């Protein structure tokens, strides 16, 4: 029977490889709490966790008691079309006045400095790493593409590459027809020469 | 075509089968005198030819 | 919950006819199929035997066909070895008896 | 227990129809075999035959 | 251990898994191809030399005739259909439509082992028995039936081999059609399936319609030989036999070629990183070629004495079938443009050679379509040049594209590109030196199926000699490359 | 060889790897019940040639 | 007057699974069709319904993703896909497939769409005629589910 | 509890993957041996017994797979395959009719006998009449087969309703 | 019509597929919600429960109340004391009612054969293995055919038919 497995817990096989933990891959052998809880030691972190846990318990109890023992003065039933499972979301994601524009601009600047450039650099590294993985004779890296490739849109390509090519093909067609007829028969419109 | 068309077609097929049955039997009966006459004629011709050759 | 209930104890349904048969012969498709069957039974079959009765004591005077003449008795010198050895047609039972054709029997098994 | 029931078998339409069709097919086979041997003059070694 | 041996045998004999049956089909197809190539080398050595250098007798030319007939049959029925259709058809068809197995799983195993019994009977009859069949792959009577050199049971066993091969192909065709029709994942419409799947479907439709007629023809041959009937003798119609055979015959060649088109399109989509140009057009052209191929069969019979109006009709129909193939060629040429195909890839260069050689073969075969001009080119080496620059230079290179593409995916090892380049380039050059001259030898008047030729045809056969040496080099390189593919390193040191 | 022929006479019967004799059952039963006085015995160990 | 009893369909297994819950199984095996060329032309010039699309969050946002459900084994990667052209710059010739871990937020950076392919296992009662005909409670189901989670169960193949 | 897979019939390994090919091989070698030595290597009844016994596996597996593995997708596949098989049989009959009628549609023919008119009373119907073809019995058999077709269609529809 | 000949909607492309008038009926609907195309000319009968079968091997998996709720009938002659309930189309629940009379189709040979395939035999993944001796015969036949083929090849090639030695 060999080494039969015991239980049926998850194993990384061909059908499943799991969801990678990038945080542990990057922060390997380095603590995370100096970034998530700056300036605190382990005992302070534990004490803070305990204090906040008790406070959260109290607040949750208060909220549940409130919601479960309040008198109903109004009933709100949203309007939806028949056959529709859920009502449409009443929240819009587009700024309407200029103050909302300024608020979203400040948010965008922060996000750019702190959430978008990190994504860009991570993706650039991922692309280069895929290249390195496929390099060295394993895959077809460097066989085509690169940064010197000339990428053209559909309109540019058809207008500047396809039509001139077909034009040259047509001219070649006519010229070859005439030259081949002359070569074989020795005339242009009279079939064989010295015969008719 | 509907079911009525198919019933009509089956009726026509039955009529054709009946026609063929009757025609076959009547023709088989009707060729007996002709075949007998042909046999007698060829028998007579054979005997006459043998007599002449002898 | 499962449909197996109606498989184990299917409902019983009430008819106004003495049997399903009668009830099932009110559909026009079944009626037309029965009509076709009756057409074939009535017309051709009863007529066939009628002709058999009408010409029971009369000859079949159709002239015989002419297959192979006397001068072509050798079939132009063509080989005529059947796969069963002799030179007899498969269903010419009488001709087989004049050429055995069955003395060369094999074994029941490979040996 | 699983026991064959001739009563139910004979009170079933599919059993009757298939048996009748098999019988008619056997009759047809025997009749066609009877015309291949003792009816015809031409064998399988001819042009039309 | 007995348990391990029985497990292996049962794994490869009781299987009904499409992947396993696909690899079995591929292996058998490659082996049959190699055997046919060896026989072809014997043929070429007979042709390359003067004075019957190999057979040494005029009474023994039946050996050469056996060679040509078995070469034709092996290469057509046992090499290119098991590889083109059986191998990638079973392996890929369920995968591309997102299903588990083909419908009728058992019939797949039945099909493969029917192929195997056919190969076994054929090899035992034509190798281990004396005086085999010597009538070309087109088993024309009365040569096949009424002939002194064809009396043994080897001929009958070969005919029954043709029967079993037909049975296997029919089973495969039915299975492919049924699986593609009903087993597509939700959201995949019939005409959006992969182009290879559609080509397999049309090939299957071709095989279903025509094989029973070939079965009838071969049974006629068997009955003539054994029951001593005159179906095709002097009181018969050898032309009837030819009509039936060729009603099967041309659908067979289009069956051979269409899956190569499907595979080439699929692999192109994979290796150029761009979709097919005019996918709908290519699919419709495939189905059009499939349908039109059923109305042209008698273009192989322009000299048997057809009616003049029938000759005109068959030339017309051949032109009609020419049209959609041109559409497909233009679609391929435009597909390759604006792509990013790998520039050091045996698949890319094999595609180039496939395209060029197929265009050349199509043109040469379009010359043969005209009835009148077929008076001067029937049963010459022009026809051999045609159907070898098609079969042995386009269909073969399509299978080489598939081979150099799917090996890293089936086995998980890369491909030795330089080695494979040597193989492919020498295969191209060596074949072009053997087959191209045949064309100009056909026009000059050389007849086919002859081991000895007049002194006027020396240069063509000298060029053929050169080509045969190059072909030997190329095929040895190929087999050695594959052996090296599955072998670990043999030298290693410290630098 | 003969052993293979012994268990194939009953196609629905056990095989060599799943057949247990009465003595083997008794030994397994003694082993399972952790009797103090059951002194386990060593199976006959064979070298290469014997096998 | 007579009594008739229609002959029931006795088949079990896959057939009885299909006939117990025809909505779910039909959903699994119901073919849906895509637009032809003229239909694509007729669809591309249809109008939006209201000005909501100018304000709301589209279907496929980081907060309103496209959640899809497959059947399989827990933890097995899910096969999903587009029909192409969710964006102007994305290909549309043929369907494009994807292999993604289950129960995770994935983003297609071809079109820009966030999706939640996830797996629901089709655990069903052993179809041998012992299925329950009336409402069942959580006890027996609790035992079966515990055994399946800890050890696994056979496949209906 | 069981885990439910796709609707597709996954498939089972079987011995029919090689038994049917071996049966074909046996039949063809039997024919070859009968051709060579004009005798039977194995009794024909024994051969037919082997052939019948090999093919009893189909109904058994069919029963046990219908009881357990069947749904509408599988049924549609099976019915489409049945249709294709019927089509193949039709094509086989077409090929054999082609074989038969090839020399009959072509009216002119070189005959051993005379078929011109005004030479004998019966010559003018020699080529266009094979007057031994058992027409009466053929019509009787036709009636039998019409019986079978109509009865079977009636019963099929009746049970289907 | 080609469309109707090839089992399509027909002339009207918005039309359904089933035509129960000429035998093209819906098996799924019949099995799940009964043949509602016979609804106008058939009626359920309403008033021996199924509890007598509560101890059988396959019906013991059900609760006692479930079998008590089911009422049985001989299934041959109309119970003269039983009222008639109209069969209502478009109602998916009337086929599952417990108030209507039913018939115990558990002694049907097909029922017994199915449950035996599930409850009366050891489960084999291969139906051919479900019959042990037949599988033995089949593998023996395979070996016999192999031997026959080998012997025939040997005899035909060498010209000696093994009967003289
Ligand atoms: C698919 C069919 C096929 C293939 C591949 C070939 C391959 C070759 N054939 Fe032929 N041939 C026929 C089909 C084929 N042939 C037919 C039908 C006839 C007519 C028979 C008749 O006339 O009666 C014929 C007849 C024929 C003749 C007739 C001679 C005569 O009639 O006078 C000659 C001689 O020159 C010839 C030569 C060759 C050569 C030199 C090769 C090759 O050596 C050249 C290319 C070599 C290859 C390398 C292909 C082999 C591939 C393998 C190595 C397997 C590996 C797999 C792949 C590479 C994917 N062939
Ligand atoms: C897979 C193999 C294969 C393929 C694809 C073909 C394709 C074609 N074949 Fe042939 N053929 C054979 C395999 C094949 N053949 C074999 C094995 C034999 C010999 C059988 C035997 O006798 O032994 C044979 C024999 C054969 C003959 C017999 C000659 C003779 O026996 O007398 C003829 C003649 O009609 C013929 C014609 C054609 C034509 C017209 C095509 C067309 O499909 C080709 C059309 C392709 C194009 C035309 C190219 C596209 C062109 C353009 C890019 C545009 C140009 C268009 C215009 C000018 C309008 N083939
Ligand atoms: C001439 C060749 C005909 C081939 C097709 C035969 C099938 C056929 O006609 O079926 C319809 C016919 C009639 O079918 P029907 O009575 O069900 O009507 C067709 C159904 N509607 C009206 C709804 C469109 O089938 C039969 O008559 C049954 C026996 C057929 C046997 C084959 C030979 C028939 C001649
Ligand atoms: C393997 C299949 C099973 C074994 C072979 C069966 C077929 C044998 C064919 C030769 C029969 C010769 C014979 O003896 O005929 C006697 C009989 C009768 O021969 P007969 O008519 O000459 O007998 C003389 C009769 N009188 C008295 C009138 C003179 O022949 C037939 O009935 C013809 C049967 C031919 C076979 C038809 C079926 C199709 C064959 C296979 C086709 C496959 C195609 C696809 C692949
Ligand atoms: C050279 C001539 C070529 C043309 C020959 C024309 C004559 C007819 C040839 C028929 C062969 C092709 C059959 C196509 C499919 C038929 C339907 C089918 O297989 O249904 C699925 C089933 C088996 O399918 P399955 O077992 O793979 O599973 C399908 C899934 N289930 C079972 C759940 C539905 O076929 C049979 O059961 C076959 C019938 C049994 C008896 C006959 C056995 C014949 C075996 C084939 C070789 C015969 C050689 C002679
Ligand atoms: C003898 C001539 C070549 C005969 C072989 C022709 C192949 C026939 C088709 C079937 C293929 C079968 C297998 C093929 C095996 C390998 C064939 C082979 O030799 O391929 C390599 C040959 C020769 O390649 P190459 O010599 O150009 O390679 C040098 C290029 N780099 C920089 C990468 C080292 O293939 C081709 O050249 C085909 C593509 C033609 C495009 C020409 C571009 C020139 C290269 C860039 C230089 C700088 C700009 C110059 C300006 C452009 C003006 C010309
Ligand atoms: C449900 C399935 C039923 C199957 C049974 C058959 C159904 C009827 C239809 C079958 C059509 C396909 C087979 C026949 C086609 C081949 C005919 C042939 O031999 O052609 C070559 C012959 C020509 O032969 P030839 O002139 O080259 O030479 C004859 C032989 N020698 C040389 C000895 C003189 O005929 C033709 O080429 C004619 C043109 C082809 C089209 C023929 C159509 C026939 C229509 C028949 C209508 C009546 C049918 C019902 C009664
Ligand atoms: C004209 C030919 C059209 C194509 C062939 C007919 C076809 O596919 O019929 C499917 C149809 C069934 O296909 P279907 O399953 O798509 O139709 C039912 C559609 N629903 C689910 C909506 C009810 O088959 C028939 O009607 C009978 C069989 C015909 C095919 C016979 C074999 C042909 C083999 C060569 C191809
Ligand atoms: C769809 C598939 C259709 C396939 C058939 C297409 C036929 C096109 C017409 C071909 C034609 O007319 O061929 C003529 C040819 C005989 O010609 P020939 O002998 O030269 O002279 C006439 C008689 N003196 O005729 C012949 O050789 C025989 C008759 C033609 C072939 C008949 C095929 C019948 C159908 C077979 C099954 C098709 C399944 C798909
Ligand atoms: C300088 C070269 C010559 C050196 C001395 C002579 C002996 C050469 C070695 C013989 C064995 C071949 C080498 C091993 C190998 O893998 O060969 C593959 C090689 C294909 O590539 P290749 O033709 O070498 O391309 C560059 C041109 N030399 O070659 C081939 O595939 C050629 C075909 C096989 C040749 C060997 C046949 C059996 C052994 C003899
Ligand atoms: C030229 C001479 C030959 C001519 C005839 C052959 C024609 C060409 C080849 C046709 C295809 C043959 C394929 C090989 C078949 C060999 C037999 C075979 O595979 O038998 C498998 C069979 C499995 O039996 P099964 O019930 O599955 O049991 C599994 C474990 N209990 O197990 C058995 O049957 C028993 C074990 C057999 C082992 C292999 C044979 C030794
Ligand atoms: Cu052709
Ligand atoms: Zn997308």
- The helix/strand count (H/E) of chain H reads as 5, 1
Give the tokens for residue E254: 């289009």
Ligand with smallest separation from the Cα of E253: 2
Q: Who surrounds ion ligand 12 at CB < 5 A?
A: E 250
Nearest to E388 by CA among E438, E429, E351: E438
Q: Which chains touch D (3 or more CB pairs under 8 A)?
A: C, E, H, I
What whole-number distance in Å separates Cα of residue H74 and Cα of residue A144?
A: 47
Burial class (CB in 10 A: 0-12, 13-18, 19+), E347: buried
What whole-number distance in Å separates Cα of residue E146 and Cα of residue E148?
A: 7
* Other Cβ atoms closer than 10 A to C44: 22
Touch between chain B and chain G: 3 or more Cβ pairs under 8 Å: no
**Three-state DSSP class for E147?**
strand
Scored b (16 or more CB within 10 A) or e, H108-124 reads eeeeeeebeeeeebbee
CB of residue E79 inside a 6 A radius of ligand 6: no
Task: State the first-to-last Cα distance of chain C, in angstroms, to the nearest integer.
Answer: 64
CB contact under 8 A, G5 and C11: yes
DSSP state letters, E11-41: HHHS---HHHHHHHHHHHHHHHHHHHHHHHH
> Are I44 and I96 contacting, i.e. CB atoms less than 8 angstroms apart?
no
Taking CA atoms, E12 is separated from A157, E165, E444, H125, in Å, by: 53, 20, 52, 65
Residues ending a continuous segment of chain D before a break (C–N > 2.5 Å) = none
Maximal CA-CA distance, chain E: 82
* Other Cβ atoms closer than 10 A to H40: 18
What whole-number distance in Å separates Cα of residue E27 and Cα of residue E116?
A: 11
What whole-number distance in Å separates Cα of residue G67 and Cα of residue G120?
A: 12
What whole-number distance in Å separates Cα of residue H65 and Cα of residue E106?
A: 13
Give the tokens for residue E78: 């046992």
From the CA of H102, how many Å to the nearest CA of chain E?
8
CB contact under 8 A, B38 and H121: yes
CB contact under 8 A, I127 and H60: yes
Give contacts of D2 with chain I, Cβ < 8 Å.
109, 112-113, 116
Q: Which residues pair with G117 in a beta bridge?
A: G68
What are the strands, taking DSSP E only, across chain A?
A: none
Give the tokens for residue B2: 């509907």
The verdict on E335 touching A (C-beta cutoff 8 Å) is: no
E315 labeled part of a ligand binding site: no
What whole-number distance in Å separates Cα of residue I34 and Cα of residue I21?
A: 16
**Three-state DSSP class for F19?**
coil
Angle of CA points B8, B12, B18, to nearest 5°: 145
What ligand 3 atom has the least distance to the C-alpha of B7? 16
CB contact under 8 A, E275 and G30: no
Q: Which residues pair with G107 in a beta bridge?
A: G114
> Are E207 and E290 contacting, i.e. CB atoms less than 8 angstroms apart?
no
Say which residue the tokens 């469309």 belong to.
I3
Distance (angstroms) between ligand 1 centre and the Cα of E114 equals 24
What whole-number distance in Å separates Cα of residue H22 and Cα of residue I148?
A: 10
Angle of CA points E80, E82, E84, to nearest 5°: 55
Atom 21 of ligand 7, residue of closest alpha carbon:
H102
DSSP state letters, D12-48: -HHHHHHHHHHHHHHHHHHHHHHHHHTT-S--TTSS-
Say which residue the tokens 């009449």 belong to.
H129
CB of residue E257 inside a 6 A radius of ligand 2: yes
Give contacts of A161 with chain E, Cβ < 8 Å.
337-338
Q: Which residues pair with G115 in a beta bridge?
A: G66, G106
E150 secondary structure, DSSP code: B
Q: What are phi and psi of E447, to 5 degrees?
A: -90, 155
Q: How far is CA G9 from the centre of its chain?
A: 28
DSSP state letters, E228-292: ---SSSTTS-HHHHHHHHHHHHHHHHHHHHHHHHHHHHHHHHHHHSS--TTHHHHHHHHHHHHHH
Give the tokens for residue H92: 């086989």
Output Rg (C-alpha) for chain A, integer angstroms: 36
Scored b (16 or more CB within 10 A) or e, E1-37 reads eeeeeeeeeeeebbbbbbebbbbbbbebbbebbebbb
What are the strands, taking DSSP E only, across H25-146?
A: none
| Technique that determined the structure | cryo-EM
Nearest to E206 by CA among E289, E140, E134, E278: E289
What ligand 4 atom has the least distance to the C-alpha of E216? 44
Please report the number of interchain residue pairs, chain B to chain C, with beta-carbon separation below 8 angstroms: 60
What whole-number distance in Å separates Cα of residue E263 and Cα of residue E398?
A: 7
What whole-number distance in Å separates Cα of residue I34 and Cα of residue I32?
A: 6
Nearest CA in chain I to H155: I23
> Are E18 and E90 contacting, i.e. CB atoms less than 8 angstroms apart?
yes
The verdict on D47 touching E (C-beta cutoff 8 Å) is: yes
Residues ending a continuous segment of chain C before a break (C–N > 2.5 Å) = none
> Are G94 and E192 contacting, i.e. CB atoms less than 8 angstroms apart?
yes
Taking CA atoms, I92 is separated from E120, G136, H68, I35, in Å, by: 61, 22, 27, 11
Q: What are phi and psi of A142, to 5 degrees?
A: 85, -5
Atom 6 of ligand 8, residue of closest alpha carbon:
I6
Taking CA atoms, E462 is separated from C12, E321, E433, in Å, by: 91, 36, 10
Burial class (CB in 10 A: 0-12, 13-18, 19+), H100: exposed
**Three-state DSSP class for I90?**
coil
Beta-carbon contacts of I114 under 8 Å, excluding residues fewer than 6 positions away, are: G10, G11, G12, G129, H67
What whole-number distance in Å separates Cα of residue H26 and Cα of residue F35?
A: 64
E146 labeled part of a ligand binding site: no
Q: Which residues pair with I19 in a beta bridge?
A: I24
What whole-number distance in Å separates Cα of residue H136 and Cα of residue H125?
A: 20
Going by their DSSP bridges, the two strands H2-4 and G155-156 should be labelled as: parallel
Going by their DSSP bridges, the two strands G106-108 and G113-119 should be labelled as: antiparallel
Question: Nearest Cβ partner of E189 from G28, G33, G79?
Answer: G33
CB contact under 8 A, G30 and E279: no
> Are C12 and I97 contacting, i.e. CB atoms less than 8 angstroms apart?
no
The verdict on B16 touching C (C-beta cutoff 8 Å) is: no
**Three-state DSSP class for G118?**
strand
The verdict on C24 touching G (C-beta cutoff 8 Å) is: no
What whole-number distance in Å separates Cα of residue E115 and Cα of residue E109?
A: 10
Give the tokens for residue A168: 């040259």
The verdict on B27 touching C (C-beta cutoff 8 Å) is: yes
**Three-state DSSP class for I49?**
strand
Beta-carbon contacts of I152 under 8 Å, excluding residues fewer than 6 positions away, are: H29, H30, H32, H33, H41
Say which residue the tokens 């006085």 belong to.
F37
The HSE-up count of residue E145 (CA atoms within 13 Å, CB side) is 27
Is the Cα dihedral H3, H7, H11, H16 positive or negative? positive
DSSP state letters, I100-119: BEE--TTSSHHHHHHHHHHH
* Other Cβ atoms closer than 10 A to I62: 21
DSSP state letters, C25-63: TTSHHHHHHHHHHHHHIIIIIHHHHHHHHHTTTS---PP
Cis omega before residue E142 (within 30°)?
Answer: yes
The verdict on G64 touching A (C-beta cutoff 8 Å) is: yes
Ligand with smallest separation from the Cα of E231: 7
Distance (angstroms) between ligand 6 centre and the Cα of E343 equals 9
E52 φ/ψ sector (left φ>0, alpha ψ -120 to 50, else beta): left
Q: Which residues pair with G98 in a beta bridge?
A: G80
Question: Nearest Cβ partner of A144 from E338, E340, E414?
Answer: E340
Taking CA atoms, C54 is separated from B16, B22, C41, E308, in Å, by: 19, 10, 19, 54
Resolution in Å, one decimal, please.
3.1
G153 secondary structure, DSSP code: -
What whole-number distance in Å separates Cα of residue G75 and Cα of residue G101?
A: 8
The verdict on C87 touching D (C-beta cutoff 8 Å) is: no
Say which residue the tokens 């690899």 belong to.
E23
Touch between chain H and chain I: 3 or more Cβ pairs under 8 Å: yes
> Are H3 and G76 contacting, i.e. CB atoms less than 8 angstroms apart?
no
Residues within 8 A of I (CB atoms), C 70-109 only: 107
**Three-state DSSP class for G68?**
strand
Atom 12 of ligand 3, residue of closest alpha carbon:
B6
CB of residue E380 inside a 6 A radius of ligand 6: no
């Amino acid at each position: 029977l060999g080494h039969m497995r015991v239980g049926a817990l998850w194993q990384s096989n061909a059908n499943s490889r799991g969801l990678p933990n990038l945080l542990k891959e990057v922060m390997a052998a380095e603590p995370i709490y100096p970034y998530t809880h700056p300036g605190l030691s382990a005992k302070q972190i534990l004490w803070n966790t305990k204090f906040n846990l008790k406070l959260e318990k109290d607040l949750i109890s208060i909220a549940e008691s409130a919601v479960q023992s309040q008198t109903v003065n109004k009933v709100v039933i949203p309007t939806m079309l028949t056959g529709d499972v859920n009502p449409k979301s009443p929240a819009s994601v587009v700024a309407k006045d200029k103050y909302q524009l300024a608020k979203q601009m400040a948010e965008f600047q922060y996000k750019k400095s702190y959430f978008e450039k990190p994504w860009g650099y991570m993706f650039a590294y991922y692309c280069d790493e895929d290249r390195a993985r496929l390099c060295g004779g394993i895959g077809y890296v460097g066989h085509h593409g690169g940064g010197d490739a000339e990428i053209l849109s559909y309109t540019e390509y058809v207008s500047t590459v396809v039509y001139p090519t077909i034009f040259y093909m047509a001219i070649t067609f006519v010229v070859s027809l005439f030259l081949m007829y002359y070569y074989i028969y020795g005339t242009f419109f009279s079939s064989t020469r010295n015969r008719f | 075509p509907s079911s009525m068309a198919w019933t009509i077609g089956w009726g026509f097929y039955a009529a054709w089968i009946m026609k063929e049955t009757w025609n076959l039997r009547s023709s088989s009966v009707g060729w007996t005198p002709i075949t007998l006459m042909e046999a007698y004629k060829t028998k007579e011709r054979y005997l006459r030819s043998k007599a002449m050759m002898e | 919950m499962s449909t197996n209930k109606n498989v184990f104890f299917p409902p019983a349904l009430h008819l106004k006819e003495n049997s399903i048969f009668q009830y099932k012969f009110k559909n026009l498709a079944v009626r037309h199929d029965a009509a076709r069957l009756g057409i074939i039974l009535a017309g051709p079959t009863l007529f066939y035997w009628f002709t058999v009765y009408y010409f029971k004591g009369m000859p079949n005077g159709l002239p015989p066909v002419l297959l192979n003449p006397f001068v072509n008795r050798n079939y132009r010198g063509q080989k005529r070895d059947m796969p069963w050895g002799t030179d007899c047609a498969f269903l010419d039972t009488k001709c087989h008896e004049e050429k055995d054709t069955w003395a060369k029997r094999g074994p029941f098994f490979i040996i | 227990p699983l026991v064959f029931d001739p009563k139910r078998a004979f009170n079933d339409e599919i059993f009757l129809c298939c048996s009748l069709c098999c019988i008619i097919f056997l009759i047809f086979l025997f009749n066609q075999y009877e015309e291949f041997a003792h009816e015809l003059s031409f064998d399988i070694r001819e042009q039309f035959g | 251990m007995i348990n391990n041996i029985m497990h292996m045998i049962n794994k490869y004999t009781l299987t009904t898994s499409h992947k396993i049956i696909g690899i079995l089909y591929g292996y058998m197809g490659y082996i049959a191809g190699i055997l046919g190539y060896i026989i072809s080398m014997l043929i070429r050595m007979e042709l390359n030399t003067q004075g019957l250098a190999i057979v040494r007798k005029v009474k023994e030319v039946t050996i050469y005739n056996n060679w040509i007939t078995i070469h034709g049959l092996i290469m057509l029925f046992v090499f290119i259909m098991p590889v083109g259709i059986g191998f990638y058809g079973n392996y890929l068809i369920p995968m591309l439509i997102g299903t588990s197995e083909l419908s009728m799983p058992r019939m797949n195993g039945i099909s493969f082992w029917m192929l195997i019994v056919g190969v076994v009977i054929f090899v035992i009859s034509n190798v281990l028995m004396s005086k085999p069949i010597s009538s070309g792959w087109t088993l024309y009577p009365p040569l096949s039936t009424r002939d002194a050199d064809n009396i043994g049971v080897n001929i009958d066993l070969s005919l029954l081999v043709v029967h079993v091969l037909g049975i296997s192909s029919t089973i495969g065709s039915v299975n492919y059609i049924t699986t593609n029709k009903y087993n597509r994942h939700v959201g995949l419409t019939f005409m959006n399936i992969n182009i290879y799947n559609f080509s397999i479907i049309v090939t299957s439709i071709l095989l279903i319609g025509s094989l029973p007629i070939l079965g009838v023809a071969i049974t006629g041959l068997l009955l003539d030989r054994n029951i001593n009937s005159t179906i095709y003798d002097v009181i018969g119609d050898p032309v009837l036999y030819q009509h039936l055979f060729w009603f099967f015959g041309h659908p067979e060649v289009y069956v051979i070629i269409l899956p190569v088109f499907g595979l080439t399109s699929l692999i192109l989509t994979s290796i150029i990183h761009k979709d097919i140009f005019g996918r709908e057009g290519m699919m419709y052209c495939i189905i059009s070629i499939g349908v039109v191929g059923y109305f042209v069969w008698a273009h192989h019979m322009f000299t048997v004495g057809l009616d003049i109006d029938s000759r005109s009709y068959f030339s017309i129909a051949t032109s009609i079938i020419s049209i959609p193939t041109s559409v497909k060629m233009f679609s391929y040429i435009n597909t390759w443009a604006s792509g990013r195909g790998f520039r050091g890839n045996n698949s890319s260069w094999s595609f180039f050679s496939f395209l060029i050689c197929f265009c050349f073969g199509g043109f040469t075969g379009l010359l043969l379509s005209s009835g009148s001009l077929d008076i001067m080119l029937h049963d010459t080496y022009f026809v051999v040049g045609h159907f070898h620059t098609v079969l042995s230079l386009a269909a073969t290179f399509g299978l080489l594209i598939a081979h150099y593409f799917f090996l890293p995916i089936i086995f998980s090892y890369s491909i030795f590109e330089s080695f494979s380049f040597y193989h492919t380039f020498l295969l191209l050059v060596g074949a072009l030196l053997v087959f191209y001259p045949m064309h100009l030898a056909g026009l000059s008047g050389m007849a086919r199926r002859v081991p000895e030729y007049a002194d006027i045809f020396i240069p063509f056969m000298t060029v053929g000699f050169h080509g045969t040496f190059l072909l030997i080099f190329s095929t040895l390189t190929f087999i050695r490359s594959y052996f090296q593919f599955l072998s670990h390193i043999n030298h290693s040191n410290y630098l | 060889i003969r052993n293979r022929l012994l268990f194939t006479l009953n196609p629905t019967g056990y095989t060599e790897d799943t057949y247990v004799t009465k003595e083997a059952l008794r030994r397994q039963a003694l082993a399972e019940s952790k009797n103090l006085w059951y002194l386990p015995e060593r199976p006959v160990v064979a070298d290469q040639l014997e096998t | 007057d007579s009594v008739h009893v229609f002959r029931p369909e006795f088949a079990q297994g896959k057939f009885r699974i299909d006939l117990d819950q025809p909505a779910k199984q039909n959903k699994l095996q119901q073919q849906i069709y895509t637009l032809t060329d003229d239909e694509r032309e007729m669809y591309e010039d249809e109008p939006y319904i209201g000005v909501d699309h100018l304000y709301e969050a589209h279907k496929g946002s980081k907060e309103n993703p496209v959640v899809v459900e497959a059947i399989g084994v827990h933890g097995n990667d899910v096969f999903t896909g587009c029909l192409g052209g969710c964006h102007k710059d994305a290909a549309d010739a043929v369907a494009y497939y994807t292999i993604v871990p289950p129960n995770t937020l994935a983003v297609c950076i071809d079109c820009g769409i966030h999706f939640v392919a996830r797996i629901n296992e089709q655990l069903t009662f052993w179809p041998d005629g012992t299925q329950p005909w009336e409402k069942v409670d959580f006890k027996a189901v609790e035992g079966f589910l515990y055994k399946h989670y800890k050890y696994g169960s056979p496949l209906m193949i | 509890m069981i885990l439910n897979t796709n609707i597709n019939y996954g498939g089972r390994n079987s011995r029919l993957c090689y038994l049917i090919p071996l049966m074909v091989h046996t039949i063809f070698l039997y024919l070859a041996y009968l051709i060579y030595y004009n005798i039977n290597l194995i009794n024909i009844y024994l051969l037919l017994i082997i052939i019948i016994f090999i093919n009893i596996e189909w109904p058994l597996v069919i029963i046990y797979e219908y009881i357990y593995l069947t749904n509408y997708n599988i049924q549609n596949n099976l019915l489409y395959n049945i249709a294709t098989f019927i089509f193949l049989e039709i094509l086989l009959f077409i090929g054999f009719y082609w074989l038969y009628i090839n020399n009959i549609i072509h009216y002119p023919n070189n005959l051993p006998y005379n078929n011109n008119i005004a030479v004998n009373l019966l010559d003018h119907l020699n080529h266009n009449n094979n007057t031994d073809i058992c027409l009466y019995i053929i019509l009787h058999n036709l009636l039998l087969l019409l019986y079978v077709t109509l009865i079977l269609q009636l019963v099929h529809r009746y049970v289907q309703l | 019509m080609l469309s109707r000949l090839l089992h399509g909607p027909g002339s009207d492309k918005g039309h359904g597929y089933f035509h129960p008038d000429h035998g093209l009926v819906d098996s799924a609907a019949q099995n799940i919600r009964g043949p509602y195309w016979h609804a106008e000319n058939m009626q359920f009968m309403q008033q021996e429960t199924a509890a007598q079968s509560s101890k059988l091997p396959v019906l013991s998996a059900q609760d006692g109340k479930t079998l008590q709720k089911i009422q049985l009938t001989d299934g041959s002659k109309v119970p003269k004391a039983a009222t008639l309930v109209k069969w209502n189309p478009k109602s998916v629940h009337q086929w599952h009612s417990d108030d209507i009379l039913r018939v115990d189709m558990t002694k049907h040979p097909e029922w017994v054969r199915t449950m035996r395939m599930f409850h009366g035999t050891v489960w084999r993944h291969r139906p051919e293995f479900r019959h042990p001796w037949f599988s033995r015969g089949s593998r023996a036949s395979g070996i016999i055919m192999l031997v026959f083929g080998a012997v025939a090849y040997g005899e035909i090639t060498f010209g000696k038919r093994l009967g003289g030695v």
